[PDB]
Amino acid sequence: KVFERCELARTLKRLGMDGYRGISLANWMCLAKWESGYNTRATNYNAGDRSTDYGIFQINSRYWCNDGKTPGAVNACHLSCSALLDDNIADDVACAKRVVRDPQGIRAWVAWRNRCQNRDVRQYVQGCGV
Ligand SMILES: [Ca+2]
């Protein structure tokens, strides 16, 4: 499913992402935007390391979910990568929260540093009533 901007913003707020481990809602919106374009079915194969990025947050199969075909992989979220491709982002969110609980936090996603860090990210939540 492809979310509309404000519809996702309101969903994330309900799911408790605003201020999670110090990360503002606008940051999470910025990340979802550059990672998947707000598409829950998004998938990216990394030919280079044989891992795949899944879902709205492009969660990588080497560490966070199990797809069975990633060598030397762990499944820190205790989820099938499969679960990150449906239309319900409740587990995606629970997993994203798990990612940022690691030392690195949101920096774990290079697109955040490239596209969101030290930027005015208000654009992503303006007018959404969140
Ligand atoms: Ca899901």
4 is catalytic: no
What's the gap in Å between 87 CA and the centre of ligand 1? 6
53 belongs to the catalytic site:
yes
- What gap in Å lies between CA 60 and CA 77, rounded to an integer? 11
Cα 103 to ligand 1 centre (Å)? 24
> Which technique?
X-ray
Integer angstrom CA distances of residue 114 from 10, 20, 47, 103, 118: 25, 21, 21, 19, 10
What's the CA dihedral at 55, 41, 17, 26 to 10 degrees? 100
The residue extents of the domains of the chain are 1-130
Q: Among 4, 35, 67, 120, which one carries the catalytic annotation?
A: 35
Cα of 83 vs centre of ligand 1, distance in Å, is: 5
CATH number of 1-130: 1.10.530.10
Quoted resolution (Å): 1.8
For the chain, the C-alpha Rg in angstroms (whole number) is 14
